[PDB]
Structure 1
Amino acid sequence: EDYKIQSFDLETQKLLKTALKDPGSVDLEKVSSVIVDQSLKDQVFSREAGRICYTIVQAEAKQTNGSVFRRNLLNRLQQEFKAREETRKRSTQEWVCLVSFICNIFDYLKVNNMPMVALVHPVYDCLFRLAQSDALKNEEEVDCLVLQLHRIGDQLEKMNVQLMDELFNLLRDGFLLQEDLSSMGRLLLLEILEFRAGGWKLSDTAQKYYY
């Protein structure tokens, strides 16, 4: 029904909808390549693509009893991941979009209904980059950091606690240490430092303050 599908070309919107039910009748190499590319660009799509990507792998399991689409999608995405530091120079919009998209994937795309181990260290690599002294300045990127930790921190800690410990050791440093930290960037950090400390819940009293 609704996937916020409009963002795309009207004839691409024809390829995808039919790729939802029938992966055998569509070129899955296109479908994967199509998704990755615009999602980098359209930030709204950087949060709705997960839903779509999963349901496709579910179909190909059902129809071809196989995943080929998943290979193309992961290969396509690992490429863009490796080339991230170049994309961070090229754009912040494009950088934040990619991170947003990788997390969105990790969250919905599952292997026998379990999170893909393959993406743990990648995702943590992104979040560590966003937690750097340079990135904490830019309040496009701090926006991004905390939007992820709001919806996937829970499972990431569960996957690996030491990394999460290090990440939050950086944020604590980035709060005491940093001479210039964005005014409302300072706000969004303290909020998660609490969020996590309360076991990935925002307390009622904290909910009033920040909202």
Structure 2
Amino acid sequence: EDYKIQSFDLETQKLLKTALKDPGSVDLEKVSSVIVDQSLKDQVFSREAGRICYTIVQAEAKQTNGSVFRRNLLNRLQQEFKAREETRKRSTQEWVCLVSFICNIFDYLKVNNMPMVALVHPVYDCLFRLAQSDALKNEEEVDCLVLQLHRIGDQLEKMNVQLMDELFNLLRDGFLLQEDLSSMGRLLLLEILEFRAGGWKLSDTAQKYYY
């Protein structure tokens, strides 16, 4: 149904819709390229691109037994991931979009509900970046971080619990020690600390307190 592609050109939406049903009829390298381009420019699409990406990947595998789209999508994703520090320096918004996109691809591009190990290190590297002092000092980055933890924290922890323990240690540190967090940042961090402590869920009383 809803692939959340409202932010694109009418013409580009037409291309994406065509890719969905008949990937053999489109240039899948180009399709991957327009998807990753827009994922950096639109908050909603950065958080929802996985829906259309999974559907094209499945369609291509069923049609031609091919993974041209996936390979091109993940190559481009790796290119953007590698340039994440310069992207963060250029634009906090493009950087938080990139993180949401990588994490959304992790969640949707599955073999069963087996995630792709190739995405584990990209996801963790981004979350660890967000958990540094000089990122927690930015409320936009904290919002991004906790969105990913709500979305895929439980799955990620399974993929590597020690990394998750180390990540949450940074979160306690930032929460405990670092003075220059906004009220909204401090609140987001406390909620996610309670969220993991409760087994990646929101108790009724915490729901009422925060929301």
TM-score by length of 2: 0.98
The corresponding residue for 2:133 is 133
The corresponding residue for 1:115 is 115
Q: Which runs of 4+ in 1 moved over 4 A?
A: none
Offset at 1:113? Answer: 4.4
Task: Output the CA distance in 2 between the equivalents of 1:119 and 1:57.
Answer: 16
Task: Output the CA distance in 2 between the equivalents of 1:136 and 1:24.
Answer: 44
Task: Output the CA distance in 1 between the equivalents of 2:210 and 2:198.
Answer: 15
The corresponding residue for 2:42 is 42
SS at 1:56's partner residue?
Answer: helix
Task: Output the CA distance in 2 between the equivalents of 1:113 and 1:202.
Answer: 23
Task: Output the CA distance in 2 between the equivalents of 1:182 and 1:97.
Answer: 21
Q: Deviations over 1:132-166 (max 9, x none)?
A: 10100111000000011001001000110000000
Q: Deviations over 1:109-135 (max 9, x none)?
A: 113542000011110000000001010
Q: Conserved in 2, the CA contact under 8 Å of 1:20 and 1:55?
A: yes
Q: Conserved in 1, the CA contact under 8 Å of 2:47 and 2:97?
A: no
Task: Output the CA distance in 2 between the equivalents of 1:182 and 1:113.
Answer: 37
Offset at 1:5? Answer: 2.0
Q: Conserved in 2, the CA contact under 8 Å of 1:3 and 1:48?
A: yes
SS at 1:110's partner residue?
Answer: coil
Task: Output the CA distance in 1 between the equivalents of 2:112 and 2:154.
Answer: 20
SS at 2:6's partner residue?
Answer: helix
Q: Deviations over 1:50-89 (max 9, x none)?
A: 0100010100011011211111000011000000000010
Give unmatched runs, 5+ long, in structure 1: none
Q: Conserved in 2, the CA contact under 8 Å of 1:28 and 1:69?
A: yes
Q: Conserved in 2, the CA contact under 8 Å of 1:136 and 1:182?
A: no
- Which of the two has greater helix per residue? 2
**Count of aligned pairs between the two proteins:** 211
SS at 1:46's partner residue?
Answer: helix
What is the Cα-based RMSD across aligned positions, in Å? 0.9
Offset at 1:4? Answer: 2.0
Task: Output the CA distance in 1 between the equivalents of 2:7 and 2:82.
Answer: 26
TM-score by length of 1: 0.98
Give unmatched runs, 5+ long, in structure 2: none
Q: Conserved in 2, the CA contact under 8 Å of 1:47 and 1:100?
A: yes
The corresponding residue for 2:124 is 124
Q: Deviations over 1:30-64 (max 9, x none)?
A: 00000000110011101111010001010001101
Q: Return closer, same or farther for 1:113/1:210 CA change in 2, 3 Å cut-off.
A: closer
SS at 2:179's partner residue?
Answer: coil
The corresponding residue for 2:26 is 26
Q: Conserved in 2, the CA contact under 8 Å of 1:40 and 1:46?
A: yes
Q: Conserved in 1, the CA contact under 8 Å of 2:57 and 2:69?
A: yes
Task: Output the CA distance in 1 between the equivalents of 2:122 and 2:5.
Answer: 27
